Amino acid sequence: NKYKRIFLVVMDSVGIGEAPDAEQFGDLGSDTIGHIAEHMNGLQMPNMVKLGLGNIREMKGISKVEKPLGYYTKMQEKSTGKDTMTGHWEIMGLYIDTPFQVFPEGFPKELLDELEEKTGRKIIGNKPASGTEILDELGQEQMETGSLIVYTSADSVLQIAAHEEVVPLDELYKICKIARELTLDEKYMVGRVIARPFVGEPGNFTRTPNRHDYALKPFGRTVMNELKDSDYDVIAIGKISDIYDGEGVTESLRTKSNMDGMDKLVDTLNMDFTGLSFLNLVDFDALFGHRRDPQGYGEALQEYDARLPEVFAKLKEDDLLLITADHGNDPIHPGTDHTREYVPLLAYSPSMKEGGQELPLRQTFADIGATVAENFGVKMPEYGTSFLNEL
Ligand SMILES: O=P(O)(O)OC[C@H]1O[C@H](O)[C@H](O)[C@@H]1O
Ligand SMILES: [Mn+2]
Ligand SMILES: [Mn+2]
Ligand SMILES: [Mn+2]
């Protein structure tokens, strides 16, 4: 193998400017990093700059360098959707025609009617809402009537809340499985179904650790599957295992924050493994992008950047670090949905003694998967062109 270990970091939603097909998605003008940098009056990301972020695109506080540490370019998304699952499935070698849907006006009557018909239970709510706010609003009615609180967020989710003393846990799980079946439909294609059991009384409801998430398998066997099948390590950090529904994963490390994600990355650097360590830094998307908070987003980017020199120090000669994103989520953009953007790509190994150069623009995110597959000598994905030989 060229590299013994590859560390792949997805900065979730960290887009680098509107894609050629942005107009189709209502995303003209979008620019996640660029708009953040303007808000911050210059983003302080000196380590990403050293890697070559400014060499991809110059932005406020982010300038090109004469000798970037590694190779750099951006990637264009080929799949139809601009969600997390689509972006990640494409990164690992797939092409996804069917987009996962978001529901700012709630779910279609047709879907909810069938859910009622299959379960024998009434549905209340049916709107985007905070999971804690909707319990204060509707939790008492739920307890009194045995109905189901169905709600959504800014992402592709269908969430079902029910009190554990009124609707038995095992019944809530059965209901969610029915919903998971019904939502495998492009009339109303939902990324995740989530059980949200709660306890307590009006004015004091608590959501329990009995939450369960019902994910879809990726629409194809991924490069992760092939790595696992060839007895390589595939270490998933953060939301990675959930995003792939565990497919191809050999170890999973839960994280509570971006800083905790970087700590687990450091943990994997300290492990003797051969294969892939795959981190998702989700805070950018979950806390700041959807909430349209450019200040919080900018601060989070600066906090992430400050962690990188320790990562640089621990990389071995036969390690490769890949940093990218899975879509955009411009915090100064109308609405609450993601944005269709190019994503940055930085590729760095300490073995790059003369620094890096510009790579040709990656025409699919699957180029990452192809590179990983070629490195480890496993079956090449159907889509994607490796850049391994360019490094
Ligand atoms: O805490 P809630 O408001 O119920 O749910 C918000 C998000 O919590 C989970 O990460 C899902 O991504 C949801 O979109
Ligand atoms: Mn838009
Ligand atoms: Mn994402
Ligand atoms: Mn999102």
UniProtKB/Swiss-Prot annotation:
Mn(2+) 1 binds at residues 12, 326-327. Transmembrane segments: none annotated. GO terms for cellular component: cytosol. It is found in: Cytoplasm. Its cofactor is Mn(2+). Its main location: cytoplasm. Keywords: Cytoplasm, Isomerase, Manganese, Metal-binding. GO terms for biological process: 2-deoxyribose 1-phosphate catabolic process; 5-phosphoribose 1-diphosphate biosynthetic process; metabolic compound salvage; nucleotide metabolic process. Its EC number is 5.4.2.7. Pfam families: Metalloenzyme. SUPFAM superfamilies: Alkaline phosphatase-like, DeoB insert domain-like. Mn(2+) 2 binds at residues 285, 290, 338. It catalyses: 2-deoxy-alpha-D-ribose 1-phosphate = 2-deoxy-D-ribose 5-phosphate; alpha-D-ribose 1-phosphate = D-ribose 5-phosphate. GO terms for molecular function: magnesium ion binding; manganese ion binding; phosphopentomutase activity. Pathway: Carbohydrate degradation; 2-deoxy-D-ribose 1-phosphate degradation; D-glyceraldehyde 3-phosphate and acetaldehyde from 2-deoxy-alpha-D-ribose 1-phosphate: step 1/2. Belongs to the phosphopentomutase family. Isomerase that catalyzes the conversion of deoxy-ribose 1-phosphate (dRib-1-P) and ribose 1-phosphate (Rib-1-P) to deoxy-ribose 5-phosphate (dRib-5-P) and ribose 5-phosphate (Rib-5-P), respectively. This is Phosphopentomutase. The gene is deoB.
